[PDB]
Design a protein around this ligand. Structure first.
Ligand SMILES: O=P(O)(O)O[C@H]1[C@@H](OP(=O)(O)O)[C@@H](OP(=O)(O)O)[C@@H](OP(=O)(O)O)[C@@H](OP(=O)(O)O)[C@@H]1OP(=O)(O)O
Lengths: 129, 834, 169, 106
RNA sequence: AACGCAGCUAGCUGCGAGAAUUAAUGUGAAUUGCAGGACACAUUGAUCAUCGACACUU
RNA sequence: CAAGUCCUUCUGAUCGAGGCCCAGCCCGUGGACGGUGUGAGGCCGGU
RNA sequence: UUGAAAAGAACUUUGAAGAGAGAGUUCAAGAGGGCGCCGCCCGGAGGAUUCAACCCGGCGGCGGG
């Protein structure tokens, strides 16, 4: 049960902010869980998705064991693109299939200056508890 | 058609990534079309999908239907080949693969899988031809050259294997990398092939060119040392071996290399070799232990005095262990004994090793360690009372030292008291329950003390939760505990459980050899080819370990007992019980038995139902069974396993690895002799006797073999004369051609000083002449001090031989022998007076 | 004694680890260690040929991780304890580790109650606690992530190599 | 202080079967109530009636169906949830002894 | 209130000739219909938000 | 800034249906809500 | 207010086209761009933890000034 008087639980209100959200906010909902190996080593459960991360699909028709890299983070449609997540168009070309970030697992992170700082900040909050 | 072909590609895609259910769902619509209902390859793929789902028979039926629908379809034959390989039916898999190749000669997958098989069952010719075809098809792949070189290497043909190696290394000379660990491994493997060919000069020259390209300096230095020893460059070998010595002063191989390079003419120079070693490096226990292996006299006296002094000042445990080898010669025994007694007396008097020493007073812990050494020494010599009093004094002085206990264990177990030792080290494990060394050794003693339940309970303190200790230890292939459990089960005549343990050993050994199949594709990717070939030569000699020997001997003695006297009476007492039992009252008791058996059947059905479901919840939560499909091994049924239909045949499967690998030990040939004697194989009698004769012609059991064979050949008349001529030649050579009685007599005078030999001679005196039982009774019960190897172990074996009836009924003589041994061995429980 | 583990002996620490340490496994990563790194596993053998000590080490497979080793298992029997057998095993294993991989450090994991090995690693081998990972083992007791830098001894190893190469010429 | 001990407690009082019944009776409301924030409905469970608040509410408030009532302030809307009497209630020793002072005897 | 401002732009929206925005701060790799432009991301920066500096046609 | 995308099974996809040593999968001072290919305390934002 | 996702129907053929016929996508085009005979008894042939009465143990109901 939520006790904060200034946070609403209204269905329409919550939906409106989710569908009408600025991109920098949308990145926060653009979050995916790390695999067990990153989670144990980084002590972090979930991370926002990025343009180049090794990503594994765990739900849907394309669910499998193969590892792929994100190639586009389409924040407008709340989807991302991996290489081998494709289907065959009618004429003959090949198009990507949008997969929601919550339905994938990050197997390798785009280790970067801002990134490296992000994990240790989340991780150091764990030893607080 | 193109659409069904695309769906077929999706099916296999699903299979390679282990989406079995998607594959079967996709093939469902393929088989929906009547034009493809009988379609062979799709049915084969479906069946190969369900085989991974556990329905072996349905997979078999569907795959044979798909195969017969289109034999030309190499896909169906390949499917059947993976089907056979899926359940380790490799011999059918080779045939299915070759049948597939008759349709698709250039399928890379079929040929590579066939090559992996051909190395699995050692098809060197077939593997060589397969790798040659792969190399022709794919010369750019380094795997082709690697496998082609492997095939010739297993042939021991190192010349063309060598030129394949140097050509392939030139292909590796494309220079895409720095000094690569895999590249270093390839260079070392090529040097291995060169040195196995005896081409030591070119091997050394080649290695002398690529030192900068090898990270493994240890292998470079050891190879240089051995090659320079082979090339008579003694000084260079000495320099390389001294570099290794500075690299690792604790390895005997480098001292051996220094000895062979320097070639000390006499013992003084050999000692001077280690003098520099322990002056440059006084710390450690290596350069000083080695002289005691060859030192004799006063020089040995002073070096031993220094060794014991520094060890006692350090107060380390294993001092006794390292000098256990010096007990072979009794002069060293007397020297060490007088030294330690003098040390104890001097420490008691003035707390010094020697009263004239100028050093500081030694701690009382040094005296405690000296008493520990004394206890172990007198335990090994055969003076249980002195060792017991010394260990009691040590324990009273320092009750917190756990090592003082295990000495008491050694004393009691060598004195014949196993239960007291087991109880004392139950106490010792109570002292330190965190260490599993004491826990495991404790379990070993009450396994030797026949407290199997107690052993099982206390090992559970460290076993993984959710499983029984016995199931867990069988699962890790716990070798020693299983063998000791089998021996214990033999002690209370539980042949079924002991055979269950032995077959667990056999199953584990089968499990090791199939593990290499997964590694077939690993190290070739890793190019750790030295580790490859030496691992491969491991499994071909895998069953040479003494663990397999003890498991096999336990099983084979069980089978020999269950064939020579195969407990022929099985249910005859029950039939004889009802002979004097009236028909009406027989109906009474059989009706009560029917009630009891059917109630107990309902009972075991209901009770096993909750435990099977509980263990199901365990195993699924363990995730080991929650994801597990394959061919489950059949239950051993220890009760049924005890009533083995062909005991000798099972034991024969057991010696087959012994008969291929373990030929050095005489017991293998003796066991084959026993089995084939119960198989009336005189033609095998002579050869088994010959093999055992070639090892130890003076073995007591082997003399039993010769005698029994001679008597049986003399009495038997059904042998053909053509066999008789060669056989008569064989005894005229091996035997003295004299009567069995006189042959046994000659053996007994030749071995009148060894107690087991006298016991065997007495047994065959009784066997060849039951009227001659009394003289054998007197011969077997002698306990003169002049008898060699008359220790207590021989004493109980003679006692139970007398009890077993090998010399007939000798209860009074057995009791007298038991009392005399009790006088000799007061602490032996097997001689405790009635 | 300390010498390399020729996979004739990979069965022997399989014998020993069950006898000594509760952190036990099957034999599969035993072949994986022996085949991948035959030069990293070292053992101790008595005059009777029976194994009395061993070290089980492995290379980390993470490419982003800096080159550093990890020991899978290391134990010594009570009969041969306090001889520095574990210590000398660690020194020789680390020497081969640097020569064949040039690692910066070495990591491991240590039982909290195995205070004797804690003494060895801290006082004797100068190892330091990196992190604490609770419930790593099956019994749930916590373990220390233990690390020692291997740059410093690699320095004198390079010095010995230079001193031997100047002598050879 | 923690939910784990609260769950263990009423598991020892053999009242956990009601909580599972509340868990089983969790479904979507039928009608426009879904549009108006009343989306999930469930059966009401036992009442815990206390005297003093030393963390009792925080330990129990996360368990579905549990209602916390102060013995000094009873609520008929929570003792007879649908206007029907006979709700299962669990009392504390202190709260139980306060009933005589709160409502008296005859 | 009017009139203008987008590479392709009518309406809506935002903006004011610095005209679908400038500066600064926070954030940290996108925007997206297409193309182009970007993008060491600290020898410091796309987008978004905030908004205190600047600018704001009749 | 807590905890299941564990196993078997329904589906086009599922958040669906069963199971989860210890009387009971894991967290719960967190079982409000929203999103995510049905219906989700433990996938994500949050709470 | 299509569809989970445009995957928004390639290609062949008639027509000048609008429009069709095949084909294809999708779970779905029936979502194609303003698109959601049984109780007792008799007889026979059979089988079986078996019946009553006793002994032990447990549990209930009723009665005791
Ligand atoms: O010389 P023994 O008196 O016959 O003792 C040895 C010794 O026994 P301990 O284990 O009690 O010391 C061996 O052990 P180690 O000394 O090498 O440690 C043991 O073999 P394990 O190493 O496998 O224990 C071996 O056993 P076996 O005779 O079966 O070969 C045998 O002890 P037992 O005669 O008591 O079995």
């Amino acid at each position: 049960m939520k006790f904060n008087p200034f946070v609403t639980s209204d269905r329409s209100k919550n939906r409106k902010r989710h569908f009408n959200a600025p991109s920098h906010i949308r990145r926060k909902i653009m979050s995916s869980p790390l695999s067990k190996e990153l989670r144990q080593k980084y002590n972090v459960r979930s991370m926002p998705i990025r343009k180049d991360d090794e990503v594994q699909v765990v739900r849907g028709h394309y669910k499998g064991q193969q590892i792929g890299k994100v190639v586009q983070v389409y924040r407008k449609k709340y989807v991302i693109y991996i290489e081998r997540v494709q289907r065959e168009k009618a004429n003959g070309t090949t198009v990507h299939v949008g997969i929601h970030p919550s339905k994938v697992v990050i197997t390798r992170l785009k280790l970067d200056k801002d990134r490296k700082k992000i994990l240790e900040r989340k991780a150091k909050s764990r030893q607080v508890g | 058609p193109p659409k069904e072909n695309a769906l077929f590609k999706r099916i296999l895609r699903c299979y390679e990534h282990k989406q079995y259910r998607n594959g079967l769902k996709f093939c469902k619509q393929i088989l929906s079309n009547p034009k493809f209902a009988e379609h062979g390859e799709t049915l084969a793929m479906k069946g190969l999908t369900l085989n991974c789902l556990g329905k072996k028979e349905e997979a078999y039926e569907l795959v044979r239907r798909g195969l017969r629908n289109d034999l030309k379809s190499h896909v169906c034959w390949h499917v059947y080949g993976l089907l056979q390989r899926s359940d380790k039916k490799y011999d059918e898999a080779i045939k299915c693969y070759r049948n597939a190749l008759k349709w698709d000669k250039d399928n890379l997958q079929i040929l590579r899988d066939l090559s992996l098989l051909q190395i699995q069952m050692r098809d060197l010719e077939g593997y060589r031809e397969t790798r040659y075809q792969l190399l022709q098809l794919r010369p750019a792949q380094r795997a082709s050259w690697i496998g082609y070189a492997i095939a010739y290497h297993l042939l021991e043909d190192y010349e063309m294997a060598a030129k394949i190696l140097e050509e392939f290394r030139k292909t590796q000379q494309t220079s895409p990398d720095k000094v690569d660990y895999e590249y270093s491994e390839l260079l070392l493997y090529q040097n291995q092939v060169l040195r196995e060919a005896g081409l030591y000069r070119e091997a050394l020259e080649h290695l002398c060119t690529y030192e900068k390209q090898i990270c493994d300096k240890l292998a470079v230095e050891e190879t240089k040392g051995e090659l320079l020893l082979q090339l008579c460059r003694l000084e260079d070998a000495a320099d390389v071996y001294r570099g290794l010595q500075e690299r690792n002063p604790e390895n005997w191989a480098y001292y051996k290399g220094l000895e062979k390079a320097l070639k000390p003419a006499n013992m003084l120079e050999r000692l001077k070799i280690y003098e520099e070693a322990w002056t440059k490096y006084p710390r450690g226990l290596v350069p000083r232990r080695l002289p005691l292996n060859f030192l004799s006299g006063e020089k040995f006296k002073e070096c031993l005095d220094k060794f014991l002094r520094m060890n006692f000042s350090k107060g380390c445990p294993p001092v006794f262990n390292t000098l256990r080898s010096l007990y072979k010669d009794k002069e060293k025994v007397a020297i060490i004994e007088e030294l330690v007694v003098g040390y104890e007396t001097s420490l008691k008097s003035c707390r010094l090793f020697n009263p004239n020493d100028d050093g500081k007073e030694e701690p009382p812990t040094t005296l405690l360690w000296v008493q520990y050494y004394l206890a172990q020494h007198y335990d090994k010599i055969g003076q249980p009372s002195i060792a017991l009093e010394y260990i009691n004094t040590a324990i009273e002085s320092t009750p917190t030292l756990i090592e003082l206990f295990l000495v008491k264990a050694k004393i009691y177990k060598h004195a014949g008291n196993i239960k007291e030792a087991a109880r004392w080290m139950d106490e010792a494990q109570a002292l330190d329950t965190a260490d599993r060394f004491i826990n495991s050794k404790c379990a070993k003693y009450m396994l030797k003390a026949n407290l199997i339940k107690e052993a099982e309970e206390m090992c559970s303190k460290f076993t993984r939760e959710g499983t029984s200790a016995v199931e867990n230890l069988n699962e890790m292939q716990c070798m020693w505990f299983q063998t000791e459990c089998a021996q214990a089960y033999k002690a209370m005549n539980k042949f079924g459980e002991a055979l269950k343990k032995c077959h667990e050993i056999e199953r584990h050994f089968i499990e090791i050899t199939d593990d290499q199949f997964d590694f077939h594709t690993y190290c070739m990717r890793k190019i750790t080819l030295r580790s490859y070939v030496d691992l491969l030569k491991l499994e071909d000699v895998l069953r040479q370990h003494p663990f397999y020997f003890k498991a096999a001997r336990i099983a084979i003695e069980i089978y020999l007992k269950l064939h020579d006297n195969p407990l022929t009476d099985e249910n005859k007492e029950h039939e004889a019980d009802t002979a004097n039992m009236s028909d009406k009252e027989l109906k009474k008791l059989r009706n009560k038995q029917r009630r009891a058996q059917k109630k107990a059947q309902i009972e075991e059905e209901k009770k096993n139902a909750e435990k099977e479901k509980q263990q199901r919840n365990q195993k699924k939560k363990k995730d080991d069974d929650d994801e597990e499909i394959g061919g489950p091994k059949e239950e051993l049924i220890p009760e049924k396993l005890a009533k083995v239909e062909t005991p000798l045949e099972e034991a024969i499967k057991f010696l087959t690895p012994l008969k291929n690998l373990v030929k050095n030990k005489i017991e293998t040939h003796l066991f084959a002799f026993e089995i084939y004697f119960r198989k009336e194989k005189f033609l095998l009698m002579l050869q088994s006797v010959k093999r055992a004769f070639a090892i130890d012609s003076s073995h007591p059991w082997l003399h039993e073999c010769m005698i029994r064979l001679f008597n049986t050949v003399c009495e038997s008349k059904d042998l053909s004369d053509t066999v008789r001529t060669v056989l008569k030649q064989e005894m005229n050579r091996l035997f003295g051609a004299t009567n069995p009685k006189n042959f046994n007599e000659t053996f007994l005078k030749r071995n009148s000083d060894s107690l087991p030999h006298r016991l065997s001679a007495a047994k065959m005196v009784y066997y060849l002449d039951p009227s001659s039982q009394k003289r054998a009774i007197e011969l077997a019960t002698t306990l003169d001090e002049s008898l060699t190897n008359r220790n207590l172990q021989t004493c109980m074996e003679v006692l139970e031989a007398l009890y077993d009836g090998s010399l007939g009924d000798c209860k009074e003589a057995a009791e007298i022998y038991r009392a005399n041994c009790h006088k000799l061995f007061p602490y032996a429980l097997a001689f405790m007076p009635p | 004694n300390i010498r390399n583990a020729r996979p004739e002996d990979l069965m022997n620490m399989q014998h020993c680890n069950l006898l000594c340490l509760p952190e036990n496994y099957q034999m599969k990563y035993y072949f994986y260690h022996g085949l991948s790194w035959p030069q990293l596993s070292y053992i101790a053998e008595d005059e009777n040929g029976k194994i009395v000590g061993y070290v089980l080490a492995k290379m980390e497979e993470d490419p982003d991780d800096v080159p550093h080793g990890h020991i899978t298992s290391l134990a010594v029997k009570r009969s041969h304890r306090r001889l520095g057998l574990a210590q000398k095993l660690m020194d020789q294993a680390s020497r081969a580790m640097i020569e064949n991989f040039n690692a910066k450090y070495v990591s491991l994991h240590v039982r909290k109650s195995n205070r004797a090995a804690l003494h060895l690693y801290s006082n004797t081998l100068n190892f330091q606690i990196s992190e604490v990972e609770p419930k790593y083992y099956a019994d749930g007791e916590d373990a220390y992530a233990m690390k020692r830098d291997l740059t410093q001894m690699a320095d004198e190893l390079r010095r010995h190599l230079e001193l031997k190469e100047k002598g050879r010429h | 202080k923690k939910t784990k001990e609260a769950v263990l407690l009423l598991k020892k009082l053999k009242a956990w079967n009601d909580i599972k019944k509340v868990y089983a009776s969790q479904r979507m409301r039928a009608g426009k109530g879904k549009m108006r924030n009343r989306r999930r409905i469930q059966r009401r469970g036992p009442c815990i009636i206390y005297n003093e608040d030393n963390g009792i509410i925080k330990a129990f408030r996360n368990i579905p169906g549990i209602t916390l009532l102060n013995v000094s302030k009873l609520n008929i809307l929570k003792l007879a949830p649908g206007g029907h009497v006979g709700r299962f209630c669990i009392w504390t020793e202190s709260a139980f002894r306060k009933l005589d002072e709160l409502y008296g005897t005859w």
